[PDB]
């Protein structure tokens, strides 16, 4: 398919939200990313 500039920006963001909670945040909060999305198992919008 052919994505537009806006679509691309959104896919970009979704990929970014797909990172893990940084290690330091665990220490800083004395102790999960509920928005983890696999390209195969999950489906994005649009």
């Amino acid at each position: 398919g052919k994505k537009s500039k806006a679509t691309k920006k959104r896919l970009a963001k979704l990929d970014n939200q797909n990172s893990r909670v940084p290690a330091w945040v665990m220490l800083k909060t004395d102790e999960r990313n509920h928005k983890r999305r696999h390209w195969r198992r999950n489906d994005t919008d649009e």
Partner: protein, 81 residues
């Protein structure tokens, strides 16, 4: 008001282009045209921009490959920052 240049895109590939092709890579505002990138770059580093290639990245930002003239040296312009 938004600025054209955001910061230098420094990666292995960016280096090869700088050492081997006299090109500097930047992360620019995606509303910026090649022309605006060319100008901005010249006014900030005092060089002559010969060509500019852009790409809207999967990081959500725009990337510009700016080639300088044989008169300017990428390796040096980049070394002062």
């Amino acid at each position: 008001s938004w600025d054209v240049i955001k910061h230098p895109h420094v990666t292995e590939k960016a280096m090869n282009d700088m050492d081997f092709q006299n090109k500097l890579q930047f992360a620019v505002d995606d509303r910026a045209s090649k022309g605006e990138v060319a100008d901005a770059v010249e006014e900030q580093y005092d060089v002559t921009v010969e060509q500019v290639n852009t790409q809207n990245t999967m990081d959500g930002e725009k990337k510009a490959v700016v080639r300088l003239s044989e008169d300017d040296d990428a390796q040096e312009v980049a070394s002062r920052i």
